[PDB]
CSV table of C-alpha atoms and ligand atoms in Angstrom, one decimal:
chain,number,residue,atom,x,y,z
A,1,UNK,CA,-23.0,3.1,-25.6
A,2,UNK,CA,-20.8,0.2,-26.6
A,3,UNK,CA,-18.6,-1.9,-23.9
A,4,UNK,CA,-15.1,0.2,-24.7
A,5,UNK,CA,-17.0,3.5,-24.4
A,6,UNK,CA,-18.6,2.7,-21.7
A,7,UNK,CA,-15.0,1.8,-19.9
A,8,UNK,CA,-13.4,5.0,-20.9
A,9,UNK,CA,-16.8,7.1,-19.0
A,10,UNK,CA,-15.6,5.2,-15.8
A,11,UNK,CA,-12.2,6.7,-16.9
A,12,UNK,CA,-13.4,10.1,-16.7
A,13,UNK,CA,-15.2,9.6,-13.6
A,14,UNK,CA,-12.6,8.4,-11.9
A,15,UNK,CA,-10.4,11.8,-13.0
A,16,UNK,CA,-13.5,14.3,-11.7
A,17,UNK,CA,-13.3,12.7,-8.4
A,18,UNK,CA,-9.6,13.7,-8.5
A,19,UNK,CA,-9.8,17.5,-8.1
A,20,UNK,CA,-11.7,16.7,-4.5
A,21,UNK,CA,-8.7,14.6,-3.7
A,22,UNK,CA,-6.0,16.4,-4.6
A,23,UNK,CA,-7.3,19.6,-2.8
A,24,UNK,CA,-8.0,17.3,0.2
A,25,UNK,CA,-4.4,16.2,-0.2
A,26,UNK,CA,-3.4,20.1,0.0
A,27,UNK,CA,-5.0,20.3,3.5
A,28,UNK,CA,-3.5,16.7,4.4
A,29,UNK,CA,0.4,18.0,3.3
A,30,UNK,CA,-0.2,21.3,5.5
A,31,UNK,CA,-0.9,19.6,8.9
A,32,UNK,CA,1.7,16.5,8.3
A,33,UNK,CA,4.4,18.8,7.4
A,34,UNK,CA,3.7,21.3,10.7
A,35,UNK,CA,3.4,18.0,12.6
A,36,UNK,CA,6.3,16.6,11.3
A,37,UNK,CA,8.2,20.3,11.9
A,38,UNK,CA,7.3,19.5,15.6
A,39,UNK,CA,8.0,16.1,16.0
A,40,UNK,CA,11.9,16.9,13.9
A,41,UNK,CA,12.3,20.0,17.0
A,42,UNK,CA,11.7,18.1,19.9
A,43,UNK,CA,14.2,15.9,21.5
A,44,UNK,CA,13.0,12.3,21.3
A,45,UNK,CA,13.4,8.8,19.9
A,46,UNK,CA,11.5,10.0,17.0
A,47,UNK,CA,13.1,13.5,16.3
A,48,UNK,CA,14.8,11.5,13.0
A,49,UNK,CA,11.4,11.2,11.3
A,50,UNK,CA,10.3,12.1,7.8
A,51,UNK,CA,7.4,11.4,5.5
A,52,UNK,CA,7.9,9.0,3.4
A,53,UNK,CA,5.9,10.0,0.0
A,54,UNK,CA,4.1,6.7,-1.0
A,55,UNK,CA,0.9,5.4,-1.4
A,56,UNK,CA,-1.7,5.4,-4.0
A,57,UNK,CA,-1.9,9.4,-3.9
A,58,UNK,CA,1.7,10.1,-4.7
A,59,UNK,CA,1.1,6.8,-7.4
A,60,UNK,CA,-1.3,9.2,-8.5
A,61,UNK,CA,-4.1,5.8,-7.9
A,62,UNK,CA,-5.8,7.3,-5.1
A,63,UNK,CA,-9.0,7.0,-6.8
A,64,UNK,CA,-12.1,7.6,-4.1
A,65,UNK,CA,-12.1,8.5,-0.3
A,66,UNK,CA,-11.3,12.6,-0.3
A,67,UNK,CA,-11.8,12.2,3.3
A,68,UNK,CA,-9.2,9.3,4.2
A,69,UNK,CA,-5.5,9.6,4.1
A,70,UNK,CA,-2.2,7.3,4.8
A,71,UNK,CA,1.2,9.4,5.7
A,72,UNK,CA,3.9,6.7,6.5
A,73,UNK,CA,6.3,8.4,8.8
A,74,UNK,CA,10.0,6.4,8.0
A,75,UNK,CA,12.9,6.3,11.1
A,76,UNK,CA,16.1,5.1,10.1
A,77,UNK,CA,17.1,2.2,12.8
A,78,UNK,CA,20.8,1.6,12.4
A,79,UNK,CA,22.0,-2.3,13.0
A,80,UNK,CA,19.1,-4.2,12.8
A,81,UNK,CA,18.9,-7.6,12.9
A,82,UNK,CA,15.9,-9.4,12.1
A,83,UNK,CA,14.3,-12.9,13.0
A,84,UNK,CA,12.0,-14.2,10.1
A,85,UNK,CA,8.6,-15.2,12.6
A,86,UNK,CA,7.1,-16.9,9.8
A,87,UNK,CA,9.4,-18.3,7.7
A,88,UNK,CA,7.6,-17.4,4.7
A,89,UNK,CA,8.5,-13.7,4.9
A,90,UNK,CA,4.8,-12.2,6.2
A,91,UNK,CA,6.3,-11.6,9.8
A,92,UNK,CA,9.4,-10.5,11.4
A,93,UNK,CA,10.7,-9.9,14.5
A,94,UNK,CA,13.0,-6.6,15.3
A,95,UNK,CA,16.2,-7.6,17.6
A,96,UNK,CA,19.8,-5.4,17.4
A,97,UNK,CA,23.5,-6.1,16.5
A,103,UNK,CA,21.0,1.3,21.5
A,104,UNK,CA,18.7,4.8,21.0
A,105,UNK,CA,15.2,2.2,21.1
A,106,UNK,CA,16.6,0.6,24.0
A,107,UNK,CA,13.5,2.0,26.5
A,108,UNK,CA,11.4,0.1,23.9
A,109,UNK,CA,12.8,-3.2,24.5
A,110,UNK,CA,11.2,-6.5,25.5
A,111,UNK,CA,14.4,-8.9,26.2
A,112,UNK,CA,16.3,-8.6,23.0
A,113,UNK,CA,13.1,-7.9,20.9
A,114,UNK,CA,11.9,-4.3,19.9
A,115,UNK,CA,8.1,-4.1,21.5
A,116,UNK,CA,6.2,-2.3,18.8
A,117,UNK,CA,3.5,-1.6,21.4
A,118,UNK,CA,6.2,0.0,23.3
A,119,UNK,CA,7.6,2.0,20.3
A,120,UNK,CA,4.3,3.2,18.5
A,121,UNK,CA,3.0,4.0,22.5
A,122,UNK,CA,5.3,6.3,22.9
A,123,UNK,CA,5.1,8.0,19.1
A,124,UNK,CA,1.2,8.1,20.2
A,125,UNK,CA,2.1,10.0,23.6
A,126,UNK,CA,4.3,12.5,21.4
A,127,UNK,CA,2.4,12.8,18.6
A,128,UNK,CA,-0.8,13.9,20.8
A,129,UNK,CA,1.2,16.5,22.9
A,130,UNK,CA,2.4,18.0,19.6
A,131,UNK,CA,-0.6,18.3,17.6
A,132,UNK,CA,-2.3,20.2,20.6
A,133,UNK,CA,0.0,22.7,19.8
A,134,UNK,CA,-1.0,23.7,16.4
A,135,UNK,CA,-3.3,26.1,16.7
A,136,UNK,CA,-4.3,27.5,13.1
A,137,UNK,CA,-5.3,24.5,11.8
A,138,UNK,CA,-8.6,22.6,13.6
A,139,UNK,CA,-7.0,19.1,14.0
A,140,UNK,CA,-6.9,16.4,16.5
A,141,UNK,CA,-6.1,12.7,17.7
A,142,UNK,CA,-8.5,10.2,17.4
A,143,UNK,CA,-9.0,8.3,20.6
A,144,UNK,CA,-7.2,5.2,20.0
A,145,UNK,CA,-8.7,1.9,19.1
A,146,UNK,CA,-7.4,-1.7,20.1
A,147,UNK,CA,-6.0,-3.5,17.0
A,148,UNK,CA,-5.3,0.0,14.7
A,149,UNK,CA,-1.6,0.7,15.0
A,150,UNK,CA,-1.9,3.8,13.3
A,151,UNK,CA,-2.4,7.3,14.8
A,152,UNK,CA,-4.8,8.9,13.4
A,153,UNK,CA,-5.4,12.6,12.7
A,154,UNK,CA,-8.9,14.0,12.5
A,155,UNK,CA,-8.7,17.5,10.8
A,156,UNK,CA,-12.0,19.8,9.8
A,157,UNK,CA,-11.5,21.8,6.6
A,158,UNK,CA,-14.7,22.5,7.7
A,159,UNK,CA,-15.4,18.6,6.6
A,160,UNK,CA,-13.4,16.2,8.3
A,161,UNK,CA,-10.4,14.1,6.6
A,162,UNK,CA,-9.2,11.3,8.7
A,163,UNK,CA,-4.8,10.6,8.2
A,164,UNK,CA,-3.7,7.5,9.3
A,165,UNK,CA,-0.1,7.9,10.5
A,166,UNK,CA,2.1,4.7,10.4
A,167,UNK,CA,5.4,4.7,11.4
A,168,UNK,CA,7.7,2.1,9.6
A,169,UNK,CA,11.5,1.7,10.4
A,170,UNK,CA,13.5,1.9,7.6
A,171,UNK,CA,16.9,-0.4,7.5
A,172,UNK,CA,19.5,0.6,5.0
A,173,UNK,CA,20.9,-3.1,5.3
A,174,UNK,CA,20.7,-5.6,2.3
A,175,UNK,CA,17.3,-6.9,1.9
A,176,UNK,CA,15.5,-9.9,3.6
A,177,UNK,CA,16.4,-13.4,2.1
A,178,UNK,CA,12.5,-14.0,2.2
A,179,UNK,CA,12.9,-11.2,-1.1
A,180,UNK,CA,15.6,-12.8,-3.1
A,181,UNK,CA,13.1,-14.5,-6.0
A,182,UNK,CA,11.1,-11.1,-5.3
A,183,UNK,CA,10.5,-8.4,-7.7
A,184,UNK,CA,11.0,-10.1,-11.0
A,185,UNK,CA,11.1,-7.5,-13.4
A,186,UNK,CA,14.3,-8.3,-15.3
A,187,UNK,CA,12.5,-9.2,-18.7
A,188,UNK,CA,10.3,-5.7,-18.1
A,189,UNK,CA,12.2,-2.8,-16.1
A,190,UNK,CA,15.7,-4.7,-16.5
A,191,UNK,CA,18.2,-6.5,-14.5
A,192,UNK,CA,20.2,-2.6,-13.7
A,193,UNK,CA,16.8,-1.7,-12.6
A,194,UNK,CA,16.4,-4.2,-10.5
A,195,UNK,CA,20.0,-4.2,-9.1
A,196,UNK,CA,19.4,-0.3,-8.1
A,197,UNK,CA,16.4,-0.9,-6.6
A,198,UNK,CA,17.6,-3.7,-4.3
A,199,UNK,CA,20.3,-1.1,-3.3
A,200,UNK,CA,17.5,1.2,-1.7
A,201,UNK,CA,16.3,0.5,2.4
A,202,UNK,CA,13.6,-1.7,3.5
A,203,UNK,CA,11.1,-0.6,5.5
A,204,UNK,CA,9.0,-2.8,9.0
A,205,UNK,CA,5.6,-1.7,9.8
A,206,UNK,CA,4.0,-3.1,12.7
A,207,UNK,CA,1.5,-5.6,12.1
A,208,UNK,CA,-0.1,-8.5,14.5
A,209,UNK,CA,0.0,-11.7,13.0
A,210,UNK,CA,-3.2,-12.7,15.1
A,211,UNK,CA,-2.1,-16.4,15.9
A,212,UNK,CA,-0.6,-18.9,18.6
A,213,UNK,CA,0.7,-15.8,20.9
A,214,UNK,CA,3.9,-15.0,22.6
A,215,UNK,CA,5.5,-12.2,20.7
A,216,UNK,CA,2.4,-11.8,19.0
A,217,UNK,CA,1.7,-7.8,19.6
A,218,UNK,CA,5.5,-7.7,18.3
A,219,UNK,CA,5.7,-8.6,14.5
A,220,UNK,CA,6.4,-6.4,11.9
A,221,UNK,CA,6.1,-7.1,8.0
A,222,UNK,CA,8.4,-6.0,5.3
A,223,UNK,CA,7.3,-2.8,3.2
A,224,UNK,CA,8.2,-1.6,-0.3
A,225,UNK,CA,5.9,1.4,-0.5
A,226,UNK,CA,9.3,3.2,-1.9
A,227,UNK,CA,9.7,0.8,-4.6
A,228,UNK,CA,6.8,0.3,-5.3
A,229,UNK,CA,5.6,3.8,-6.2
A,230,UNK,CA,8.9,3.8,-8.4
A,231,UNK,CA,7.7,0.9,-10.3
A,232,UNK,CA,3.9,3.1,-10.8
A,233,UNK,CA,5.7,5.6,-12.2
A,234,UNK,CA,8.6,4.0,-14.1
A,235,UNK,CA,6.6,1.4,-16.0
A,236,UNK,CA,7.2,1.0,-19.1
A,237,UNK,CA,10.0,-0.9,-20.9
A,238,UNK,CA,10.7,2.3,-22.7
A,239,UNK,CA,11.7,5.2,-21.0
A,240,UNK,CA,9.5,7.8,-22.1
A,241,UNK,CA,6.4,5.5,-21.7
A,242,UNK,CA,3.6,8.2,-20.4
A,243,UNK,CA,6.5,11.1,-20.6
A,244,UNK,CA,5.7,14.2,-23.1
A,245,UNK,CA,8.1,12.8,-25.4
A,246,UNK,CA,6.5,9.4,-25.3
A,247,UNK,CA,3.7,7.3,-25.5
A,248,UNK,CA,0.6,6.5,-23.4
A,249,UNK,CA,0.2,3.0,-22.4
A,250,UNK,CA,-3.2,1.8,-20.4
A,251,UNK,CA,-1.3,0.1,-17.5
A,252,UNK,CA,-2.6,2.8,-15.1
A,253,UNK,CA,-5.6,3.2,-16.0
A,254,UNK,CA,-6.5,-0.9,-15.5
A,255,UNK,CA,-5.3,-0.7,-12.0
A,256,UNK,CA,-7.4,2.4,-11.5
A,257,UNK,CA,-10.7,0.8,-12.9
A,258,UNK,CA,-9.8,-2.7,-10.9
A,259,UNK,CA,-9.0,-1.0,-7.8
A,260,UNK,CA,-12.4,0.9,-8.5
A,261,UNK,CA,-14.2,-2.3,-9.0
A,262,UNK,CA,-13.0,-3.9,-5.9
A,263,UNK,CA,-14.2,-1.2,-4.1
A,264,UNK,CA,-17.9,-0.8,-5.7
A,265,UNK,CA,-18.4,-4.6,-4.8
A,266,UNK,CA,-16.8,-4.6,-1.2
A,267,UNK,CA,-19.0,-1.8,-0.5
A,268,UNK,CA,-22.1,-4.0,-1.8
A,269,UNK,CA,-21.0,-7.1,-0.4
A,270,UNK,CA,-19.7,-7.2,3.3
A,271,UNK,CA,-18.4,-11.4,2.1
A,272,UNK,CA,-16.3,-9.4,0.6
A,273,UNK,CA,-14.6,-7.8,3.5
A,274,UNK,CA,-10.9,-10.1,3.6
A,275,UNK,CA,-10.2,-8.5,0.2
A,276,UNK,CA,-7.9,-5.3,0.0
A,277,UNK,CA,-6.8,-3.0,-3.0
A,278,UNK,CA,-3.5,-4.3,-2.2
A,279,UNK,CA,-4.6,-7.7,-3.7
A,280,UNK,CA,-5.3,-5.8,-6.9
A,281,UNK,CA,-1.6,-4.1,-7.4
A,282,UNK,CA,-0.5,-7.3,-6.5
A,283,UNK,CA,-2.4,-8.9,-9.2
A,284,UNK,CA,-1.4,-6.3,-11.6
A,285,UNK,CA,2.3,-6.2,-11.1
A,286,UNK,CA,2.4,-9.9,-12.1
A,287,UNK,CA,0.4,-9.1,-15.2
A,288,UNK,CA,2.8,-6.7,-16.4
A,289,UNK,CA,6.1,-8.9,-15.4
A,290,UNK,CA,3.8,-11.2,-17.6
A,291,UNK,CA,3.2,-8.9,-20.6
A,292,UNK,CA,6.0,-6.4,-20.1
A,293,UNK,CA,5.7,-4.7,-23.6
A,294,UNK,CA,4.7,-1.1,-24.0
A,295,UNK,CA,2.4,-2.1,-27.5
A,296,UNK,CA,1.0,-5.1,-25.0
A,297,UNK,CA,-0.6,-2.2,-22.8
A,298,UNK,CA,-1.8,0.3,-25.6
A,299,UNK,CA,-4.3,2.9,-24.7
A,300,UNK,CA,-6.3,1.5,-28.0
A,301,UNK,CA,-6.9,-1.9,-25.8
A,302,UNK,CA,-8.0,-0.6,-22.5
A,303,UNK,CA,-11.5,-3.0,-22.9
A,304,UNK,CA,-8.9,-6.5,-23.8
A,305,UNK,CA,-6.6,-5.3,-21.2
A,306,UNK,CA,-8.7,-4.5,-18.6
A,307,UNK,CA,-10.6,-7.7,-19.0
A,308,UNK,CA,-7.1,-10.1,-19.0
A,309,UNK,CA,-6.1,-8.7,-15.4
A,310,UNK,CA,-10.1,-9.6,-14.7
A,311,UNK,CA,-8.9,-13.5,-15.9
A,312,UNK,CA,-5.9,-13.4,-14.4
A,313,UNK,CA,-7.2,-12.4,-10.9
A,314,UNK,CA,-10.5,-14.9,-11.3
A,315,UNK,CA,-7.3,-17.4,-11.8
A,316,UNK,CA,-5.7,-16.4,-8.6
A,317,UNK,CA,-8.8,-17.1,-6.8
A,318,UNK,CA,-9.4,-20.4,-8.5
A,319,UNK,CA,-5.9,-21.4,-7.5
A,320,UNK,CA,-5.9,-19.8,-4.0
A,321,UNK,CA,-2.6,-18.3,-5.0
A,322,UNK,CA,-1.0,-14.8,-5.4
A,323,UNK,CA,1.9,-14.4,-4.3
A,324,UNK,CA,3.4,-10.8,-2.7
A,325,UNK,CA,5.3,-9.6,-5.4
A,326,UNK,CA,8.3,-9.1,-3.3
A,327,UNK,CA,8.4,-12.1,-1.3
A,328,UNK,CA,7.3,-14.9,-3.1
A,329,UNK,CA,6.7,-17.3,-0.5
A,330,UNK,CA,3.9,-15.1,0.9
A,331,UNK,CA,0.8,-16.2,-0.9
A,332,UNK,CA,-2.0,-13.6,-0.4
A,333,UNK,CA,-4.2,-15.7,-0.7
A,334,UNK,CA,-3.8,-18.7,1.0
A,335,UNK,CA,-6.3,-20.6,2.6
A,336,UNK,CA,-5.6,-19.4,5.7
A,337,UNK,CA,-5.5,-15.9,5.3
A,338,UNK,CA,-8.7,-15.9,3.2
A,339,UNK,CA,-11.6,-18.6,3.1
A,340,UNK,CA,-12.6,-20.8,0.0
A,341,UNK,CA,-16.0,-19.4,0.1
A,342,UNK,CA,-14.9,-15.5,0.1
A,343,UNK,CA,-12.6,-16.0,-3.0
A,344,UNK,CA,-15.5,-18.3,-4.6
A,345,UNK,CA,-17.9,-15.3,-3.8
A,346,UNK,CA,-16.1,-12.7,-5.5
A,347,UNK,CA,-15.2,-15.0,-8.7
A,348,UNK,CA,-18.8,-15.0,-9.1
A,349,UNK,CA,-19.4,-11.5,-8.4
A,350,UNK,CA,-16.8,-10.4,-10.8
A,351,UNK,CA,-17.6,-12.7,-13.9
A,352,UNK,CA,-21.2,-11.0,-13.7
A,353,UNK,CA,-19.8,-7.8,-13.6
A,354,UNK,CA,-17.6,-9.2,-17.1
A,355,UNK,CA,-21.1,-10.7,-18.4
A,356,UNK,CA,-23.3,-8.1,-17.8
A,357,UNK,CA,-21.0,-4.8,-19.1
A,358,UNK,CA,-20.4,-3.8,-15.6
A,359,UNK,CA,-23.4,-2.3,-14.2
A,360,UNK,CA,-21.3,-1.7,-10.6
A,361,UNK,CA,-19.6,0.7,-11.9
A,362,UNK,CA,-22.8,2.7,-11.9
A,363,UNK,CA,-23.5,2.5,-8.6
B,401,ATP,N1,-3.5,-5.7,3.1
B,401,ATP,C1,-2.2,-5.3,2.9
B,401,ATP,N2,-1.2,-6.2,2.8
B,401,ATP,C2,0.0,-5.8,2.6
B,401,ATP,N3,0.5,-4.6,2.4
B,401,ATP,C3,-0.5,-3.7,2.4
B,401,ATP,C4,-1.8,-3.9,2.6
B,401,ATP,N4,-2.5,-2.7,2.6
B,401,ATP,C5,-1.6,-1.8,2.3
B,401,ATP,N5,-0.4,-2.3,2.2
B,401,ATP,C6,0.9,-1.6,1.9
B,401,ATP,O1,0.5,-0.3,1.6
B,401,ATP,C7,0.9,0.0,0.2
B,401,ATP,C8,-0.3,-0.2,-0.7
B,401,ATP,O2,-1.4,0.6,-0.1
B,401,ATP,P1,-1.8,2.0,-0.7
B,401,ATP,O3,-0.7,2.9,-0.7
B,401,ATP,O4,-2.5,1.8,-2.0
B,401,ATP,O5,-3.0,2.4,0.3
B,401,ATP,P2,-4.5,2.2,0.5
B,401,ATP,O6,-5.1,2.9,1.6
B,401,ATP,O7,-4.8,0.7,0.4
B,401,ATP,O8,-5.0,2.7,-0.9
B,401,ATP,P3,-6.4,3.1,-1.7
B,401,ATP,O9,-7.1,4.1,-0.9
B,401,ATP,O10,-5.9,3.6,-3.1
B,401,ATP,O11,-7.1,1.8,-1.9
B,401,ATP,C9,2.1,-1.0,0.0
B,401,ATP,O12,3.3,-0.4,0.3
B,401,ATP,C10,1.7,-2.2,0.8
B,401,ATP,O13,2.8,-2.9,1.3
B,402,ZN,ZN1,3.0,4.2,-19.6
């Protein structure tokens, strides 16, 4: 009945809707691995891929959609040299210091080229399964990934993106990036800057040329490290530790971003990613375990709600690894959309959340 009880009964929805989704996942990890099996015995460009195992389902945030999945298939591209495209961090271009050299445009890596050619391979192989029911979606202008449509009888759609992973020093766009030495530590930090990089393709939909060719920088690695190494005790969430609530707010904002975008099609330029985004600030800003105690889920959960209605006020949140890259820029998302979900989400505050029964 009261406002914190009614918060910890979206809780437990949210964990009944993850027994569809982990068996969902089951069917997912079946196909991708007999694909992968494939693509890793035939001769190609690609026969160095492997999964990389991020994303909100190995986060263990996947919190809705049984039927939609990401796999991000990584390829380690030795001596690559990159051009910043904006110089803010958001785009890059690929060049080299060749195995991609049939994927060349001049001295610039053609994604198009590259993810045509993973597309060719990927739909000769997946016609040779034949004990699972699965198949290639036709493809669709603008979607870089290939997707997989398998039926379980139901169908479950799998994005597959390829990134390119570079074992080189990270970008100087990252170099303010990840600020998390008051929280995980400065020999966190440190070791996690000693990990790859990964470039997934991504049009940066603008004044043209080697638009079709930009990449942007991705930390799915790190970041599912940080989702599961959170607290700035060691045993925060372990069996020989405490619970903290820092989860569980990202699950029930990432929950209510997606009850009002489905409402509200204004509301379409907003992503989940805006929401981890968001969060990971607020816990470089309140990095103690006893600051995210499962006893204040309600006066948590309600200062990331400020702290994002602040972010819209501002027009400013920065990527959390590139801190030039404001999310939210006027440019990437209009005055009126962010003024349209402020005012959508202090209802929801006002009015004890009646979206989430929806
Ligand atoms: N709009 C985006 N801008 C930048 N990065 C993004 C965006 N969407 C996804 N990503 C990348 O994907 C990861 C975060 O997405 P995630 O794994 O949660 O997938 P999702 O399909 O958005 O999740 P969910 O179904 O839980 O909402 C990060 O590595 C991030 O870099
Ligand atoms: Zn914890």
């Amino acid at each position: 009945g009261t406002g914190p009880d009614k918060l910890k009964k979206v809780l437990d929805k949210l964990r009944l809707k993850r027994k569809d989704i982990s068996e969902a996942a089951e069917t997912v990890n079946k196909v991708v691995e007999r694909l992968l099996r494939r693509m890793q015995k035939r001769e190609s460009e690609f026969k160095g891929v492997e999964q990389l195992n991020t994303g909100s389902y190995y986060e263990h945030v996947k919190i809705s959609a049984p039927n939609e999945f990401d796999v991000m298939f990584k390829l380690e591209v030795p001596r690559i040299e990159l051009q910043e495209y904006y110089e803010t961090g958001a785009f890059y271009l690929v060049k080299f210091k060749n195995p991609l050299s049939h994927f060349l445009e001049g001295e610039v890596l053609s994604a198009t080229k590259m993810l045509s050619k993973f597309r060719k391979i990927i739909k000769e192989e997946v016609k040779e399964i034949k004990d699972i029911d699965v198949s290639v979606e036709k493809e669709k202008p603008g979607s870089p990934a290939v997707t997989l449509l398998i039926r379980n009888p139901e169908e479950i759609s799998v994005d597959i993106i390829l990134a390119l992973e570079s074992k080189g020093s990270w970008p100087i766009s990252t170099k303010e990036g990840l600020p998390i030495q008051g929280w995980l530590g400065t020999k966190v930090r440190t070791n996690l800057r000693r990990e790859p990089f990964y470039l997934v393709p991504k049009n940066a939909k603008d004044g043209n040329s080697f638009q079709g060719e930009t990449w942007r920088l991705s930390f799915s690695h790190t970041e599912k490290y940080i989702l599961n190494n959170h607290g700035i005790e060691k045993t925060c969430c372990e069996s020989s530790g405490a619970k903290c609530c820092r989860k569980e707010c990202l699950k029930l904002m990432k929950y209510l971003l997606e009850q009002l975008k489905k409402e509200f099609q204004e509301l379409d330029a907003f992503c989940s990613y805006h929401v981890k985004t968001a969060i990971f600030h607020m816990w470089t800003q309140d990095p103690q375990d006893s600051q995210w105690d499962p006893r204040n889920l309600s006066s948590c959960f309600d200062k990331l709600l400020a702290f994002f209605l602040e972010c819209l006020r501002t027009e400013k949140l920065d990527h959390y690894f590139i801190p030039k890259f404001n999310l939210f820029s006027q440019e990437l998302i209009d005055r009126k959309s962010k003024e349209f979900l402020s005012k959508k989400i202090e209802y929801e505050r006002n009015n004890g959340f009646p979206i989430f029964d929806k």
